[PDB]
Amino acid sequence: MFTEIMRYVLDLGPTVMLPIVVILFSLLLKMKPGDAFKSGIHIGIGFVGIGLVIGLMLDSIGPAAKAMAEAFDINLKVVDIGWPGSSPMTWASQIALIAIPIAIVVNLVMLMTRMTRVVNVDIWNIWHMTFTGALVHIATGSYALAIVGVVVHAAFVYKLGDWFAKDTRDFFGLDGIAIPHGTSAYLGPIAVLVDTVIEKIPGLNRIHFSADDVQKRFGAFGEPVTIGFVMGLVIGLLAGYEIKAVLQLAVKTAAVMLLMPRVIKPIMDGLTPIAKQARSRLQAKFGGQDFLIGLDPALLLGHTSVVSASLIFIPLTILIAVVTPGNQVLPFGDLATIGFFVAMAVAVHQGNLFRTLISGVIIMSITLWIATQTIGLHTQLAANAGSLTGDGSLVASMDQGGSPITYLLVQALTLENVIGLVAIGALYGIGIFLTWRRAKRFAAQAES
Amino acid sequence: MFTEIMRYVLDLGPTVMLPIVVILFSLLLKMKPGDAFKSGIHIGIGFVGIGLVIGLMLDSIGPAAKAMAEAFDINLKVVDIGWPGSSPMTWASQIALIAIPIAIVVNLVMLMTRMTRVVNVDIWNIWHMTFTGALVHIATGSYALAIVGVVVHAAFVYKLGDWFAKDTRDFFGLDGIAIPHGTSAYLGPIAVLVDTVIEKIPGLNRIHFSADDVQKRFGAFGEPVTIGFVMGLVIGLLAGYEIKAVLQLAVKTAAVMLLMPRVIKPIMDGLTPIAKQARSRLQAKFGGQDFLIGLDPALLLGHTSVVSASLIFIPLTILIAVVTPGNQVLPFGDLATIGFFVAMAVAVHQGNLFRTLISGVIIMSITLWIATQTIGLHTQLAANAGSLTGDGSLVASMDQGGSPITYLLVQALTLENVIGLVAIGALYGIGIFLTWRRAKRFAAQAES
Ligand SMILES: CCCCCCCC/C=C/CCCCCCCC(=O)OC[C@H](O)CO
Numbered sequence A, B: 001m002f003t004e005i006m007r008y009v010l011d012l013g014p015t016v017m018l019p020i021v022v023i024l025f026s027l028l029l030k031m032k033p034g035d036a037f038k039s040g041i042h043i044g045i046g047f048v049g050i051g052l053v054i055g056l057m058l059d060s061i062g063p064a065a066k067a068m069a070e071a072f073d074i075n076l077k078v079v080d081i082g083w084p085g086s087s088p089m090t091w092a093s094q095i096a097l098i099a100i101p102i103a104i105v106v107n108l109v110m111l112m113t114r115m116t117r118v119v120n121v122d123i124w125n126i127w128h129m130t131f132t133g134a135l136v137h138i139a140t141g142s143y144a145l146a147i148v149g150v151v152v153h154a155a156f157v158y159k160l161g162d163w164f165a166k167d168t169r170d171f172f173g174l175d176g177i178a179i180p181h182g183t184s185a186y187l188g189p190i191a192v193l194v195d196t197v198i199e200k201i202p203g204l205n206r207i208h209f210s211a212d213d214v215q216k217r218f219g220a221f222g223e224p225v226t227i228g229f230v231m232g233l234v235i236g237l238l239a240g241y242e243i244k245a246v247l248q249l250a251v252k253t254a255a256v257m258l259l260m261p262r263v264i265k266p267i268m269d270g271l272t273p274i275a276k277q278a279r280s281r282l283q284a285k286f287g288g289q290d291f292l293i294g295l296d297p298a299l300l301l302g303h304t305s306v307v308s309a310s311l312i313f314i315p316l317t318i319l320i321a322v323v324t325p326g327n328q329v330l331p332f333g334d335l336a337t338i339g340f341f342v343a344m345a346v347a348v349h350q351g352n353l354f355r356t357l358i359s360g361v362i363i364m365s366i367t368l369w370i371a372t373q374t375i376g377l378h379t380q381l382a383a384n385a386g387s388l389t390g391d392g393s394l395v396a397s398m399d400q401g402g403s404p405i406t407y408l409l410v411q412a413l414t415l416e417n418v419i420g421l422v423a424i425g426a427l428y429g430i431g432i433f434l435t436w437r438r439a440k441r442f443a444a445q446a447e448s
């Protein structure tokens, strides 16, 4: 049955499934069988560590952030269940398993018609696409309209990996990798718009503040590890922790700033030989068709700037939630892994924390406002998965709940808040246009 | 008073308290302030990662070994509770908190009287000493004899750090570091005996199964990472796991071989700048004498040749427990980290799996046999700690329970089985004599 062969391939995990597809690629690419095996193990090993550092993030940074929001006594009565809560609900929809073959086919069609360079192999991030269908299915009521949302969610991110290819390869050091999924990509265009505006504003276009400058004025006290200690201290202090817990958390936050890059290196260390052999064999067929592998946006968290933005925005997002007019959602389950949101924002600004701070507030305010506009649809998905206890408490999430993709599609096929559609649609649409044009220059520059 | 501050110094953690001593020492050495902080933080990051990888060993390789051993739940009716059960029991003894100052004073007296060169900073593995005293207290009924056993254990392990210092540097890369605590060091004298016997037998002295020889023969299939995958497959199969869990475990058993070296390096990188400055200042004052810092035995598992033996000996330590004469103890809790038993054996035999296998079988048989002869004390150590029911189920553990130190100390002051005292004491005593000679030989070679 399709469901078993999929639910077996799904529950197999990236620890096993992804190595095999990478090994099978090298075996048919005339690579020595031992060398092909060696890469697959490293790719899986990196994912084991990636689950470990992220496990540290959600079990030490998460508890503190979840306590800061409660300590900051506000009126926000709806709690961000986060992507740890959104994904289980999304996998309970009737389109959960039918989306995975659909997304590949949209990729396969686009690959043949020369509409994408991304050959996605991360079949686990499709829950983001299922989320767009799930909320459309709830609002519209058409099984096809939900399926169409999956195709749109797939085709968009497949090009979101194309448009951020130089940013992933040159800034994050991920050659041949495209990061199409997750908040890092689909909120990327918002940052491409902000950095576009700032560059044309005089004076504002000359303000800089990179983490390298902190090390060029403080030394050991400006090193990324040291910042991970001080910021970890404040997160514990602002959460009412005792001096023991504050001191203990700070090293764990610092340990992220060192271990996280080390756990993502195995994937790069193993993917390098396969790409070069394939690049030595596919340039003579398809013709210079530099392909890209689609992987988890977790590989973007191995940047010292991203982790610094992640810890810095833990208190900021709680304040952005208060300030943001119209918001009723309290940040919670997505506060630990919040560098996912502002990841590609740092890449666009190339390290300028000044623009990263401006982008993040715009990013967080919009995602917090959108999640407030999807509380009703989100709570139905929770009920449609058994996650709604007898309380009936409103269920909302910043991940996928505040997605412009999922929102702009629902508000188009329903026409509830046209004013919301116009403002968000123009804001996101311009960002998509500017993100697409930036890649056009990049291709012409490199080729010539 | 003392108990309150002791727990606070203890509960603050190896991640927070060890940086404090390191930071203060560098400030004492007139080192730069920020340069002192950076070394302290990296050590904490090192111990954060150690807990993460040592938790993957316990939570993934553990249940696999706990499943293989369950086949023999019928013959061996006493279960090795392991160090995850022996350590808590030993921390409830009356001699627990008093053992920290007692062991530090012994180190000071031995350091001042120029009897040892180890400056132990792991005030957390002192429970091994408290275990020796506690069982002596249960057996002899004397508080003094319990304290005497603590001091004798402290004196032996402090001397064990000196005598196994070349191995920790030449074979492990832990310069200026001694590993005095743990099953690795105090069963090391057995390995020195096995090497001596084999090197005197003709033909058997010329058998080499080293890791490097494995790599040239196999290639990428003999590399440390690939070896862990293969053994992870067998461990999964022998535990009755499904095909997927066999494959999922195998990548995680290989991830330990790669991730563990990279979580201990921050401790090395933090301690290195301090060691050279301490050499620069204290050289002339202390007569050009080289000191060693005493840390956890977990830094010995960063050797790919040890993790392999930690997987190879998971089935063997079980199979040994069926043929060992007079064994009522089923290995269990210590199997996930069984490399903690044969660590220094790998260094003495210089990574020769032939001599490691012969040595390891001797060590496990002796510990399993001794663990059978210490059950009554262990079952009372649980009763006095509250970890017991009225069922009559007996408690045993190969960690500290099957310890030659605790057994020989108990059997000397009680004289229950004089035959067992003579046999274990002779083999251990001959080994200690061979171990001390090794230190004298190496020091004279250094002067040359
Ligand atoms: C630069 C590239 C990107 C450009 C992006 C431009 C803005 C996109 C927004 C579209 C929403 C348009 C309005 C949708 C509704 C149309 C009118 C309608 O049907 O309204 C019915 C309602 O009942 C009346 O009150």
Ligand SMILES: CCCCCCCC/C=C/CCCCCCCC(=O)OC[C@H](O)CO
Pocket (backbone or CB within 6 Å): B143, B144, B145, B147, B148, B151, B152, B155, B156
């Ligand atoms: C290989 C090592 C060789 C060298 C080994 C050297 C050992 C030195 C021991 C000193 C402890 C002296 C005994 C201290 C016991 C005090 C007990 C006590 O307090 O007794 C009164 C109490 O009320 C009763 O319950």
